[model samples]
Target: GEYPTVSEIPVGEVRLYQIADGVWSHIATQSFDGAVYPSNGLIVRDGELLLIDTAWGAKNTAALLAEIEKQIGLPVTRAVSTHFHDDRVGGVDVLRAAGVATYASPSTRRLAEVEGNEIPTHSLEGLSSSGDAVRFGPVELFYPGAAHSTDNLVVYVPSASVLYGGCAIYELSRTSAGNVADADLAEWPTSIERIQQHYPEAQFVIPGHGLPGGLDLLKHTTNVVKAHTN
Candidate 1:
């Protein structure tokens, strides 16, 4: 059985388990013997970097940032919250202190404001789509459409041809069609279809959690979108 393991990458000094080229997701293996949290981090290309979900607490985030600094020898430029989930954005303060630009969709911003600015600072960017481009060093933000979160956005690295599906990656561990509540599951699938229009022949898909990977992750999450919607 292949369990989750954190492996060193070629580019940055940051050591996260490798899923595909220029792509890495947190498995929570280093979380003080796995007490809590399942959010992940991502590194793309040689420069652009995106932390899909920030760490659980400031301590965890500080460690993650330290690892990342070891890799880039610079501060993280951007941090994307897949949704407003606390675990995903809990370390917003930590990242901001490290000089990272935080972002969430417009709706997320509204939620954050009402939810209170607990996640430090963030910019409310408009909804994203395929064909759209987000330049952050070497990583790119490509919004195919909403998925796990209406504000769900994936990071794409053209030079590497891979996509980080975030929570958009279905968490399928059980039998009965997996699980998780959906805000608007019906729309997630169509957003994924728009990938053809959004991504360049991507070869790999990295999700927020789990290891059901390969280029088919796009389609897999789409199925998840379909199941939850129906």
Candidate 2:
């Protein structure tokens, strides 16, 4: 595990873990209504503080921003959500308040609207279907097709060979498709396969949840997605 915890906060039980090179994971336990679940995403790269997903609301998101500022003294200039899930873009409202633009796929935006989430104003512009990408400095937000969520996407950092596989992918130890309730079981296997092909050289695989791992994580997720093959 490359992540080393540097901050823990009261809201959402937020914890920022320093993971390898210039990457970090902001993990938090959040409550929506009465349901409680864990959320995970990244603080990627060194030069530009690009956030991938955020904690689930103002308090936790605020805590995460404060921690990022304290730990590295950098401002979160931009952010992208992998899907419409609250945990992934839960802090979108706070991002708006901080004047940071958060981007999401069109499908993500549509689903977020349907889910009644505070939609991100910045849709992932210049998207591609031939596996093209949305460039944010050295990082790219890509859509390999639907899986965990119809609009789910992933992020890749070229310099570090890191792949942030959002909800569409799962950890190696997992025996499920993140949350089947929100997954495209029929499309998941193929979707993940596309992602694996897109980032064949991905050294570190960071799922939307669980600990990050090597490329084996993709294989693990692929198998999990097809575990109950008909």
Candidate 3:
């Protein structure tokens, strides 16, 4: 329960925190509707360095990559976009330019293209739909149906038991479903339950924003969704 911050490195508007061994959370603040919102993603290092989701935009993502190389001393060989949102895949172009192979669900890629957002290079076509998973080293990408978005996917690192819930799971402090523009309100709760059932061993749950916490974070997210839908 005591998830001590291993290290904190600030790069421009983005801040990186090592939450667990070989797992770092990258956060970037962006102004939206006259309020600053912080978005969170993950960087996991197994044998290969993998990035789960990206910073707010291209510039911020570039800074994140620079810090990763300078501080972490690892080249991010692969990345995954949890969804088509700008906070999730906004930096796909930057990753592409840096020669990092990016992966996303087939639906995510298609949605990104439809929304004019940056698309990932590889499609998780074989995974198909919810409850399906594919392993990338220690990182496992799991699709839990439509939650925050129509194509949101949660990334789990079995080595650390950390789940990158992206926007599908709410931060503990979030009082409401932050954005439901593309969310499946009816399916969101079921999706969260699926995640709970699939990764019961997950010790740390990282939301798309805010600090990572234990399984309580998942419960808190379910409450937030239920409150909003009711």
TM per candidate comes to 0.73, 0.88, 0.92
Candidate ranking (TM-score, best to worst):
3, 2, 1
Better of 1 and 3 by TM-score: 3
Residue 150 lDDT (model 1)? 64
Ten contiguous residues minimizing lDDT sum, candidate 3: 1-10
Ranked by lDDT from best down, the candidates are 3, 2, 1
Clash pairs detected, candidate 2: none
Candidate 2: tens digits of C-alpha lDDT, residues 1-230: 44422233344556777666887778776555575555678888647688888877777888888878878788788888888877777789899889888888777788889989878888777654636577776688788776787778888888788888887777765786446667777877787778888889998888776667887887788787787554
Our tally of clashes for model 3 stands at: 0
Superposed by TM-score, candidate 3 places the C-alpha of residue 14 at a distance from the truth, in angstroms, of 2.0
Model 1: weakest 10-residue lDDT segment is 5-14
Top-scoring candidate (lDDT): 3
Model 3: C-alpha RMSD to truth?
Answer: 2.7
Selected candidate, larger TM-score, 2 vs 3: 3
Assess candidate 1 and give its TM-score to the true structure: 0.73
Query: Residue 228's C-alpha lDDT in candidate 1?
Result: 52
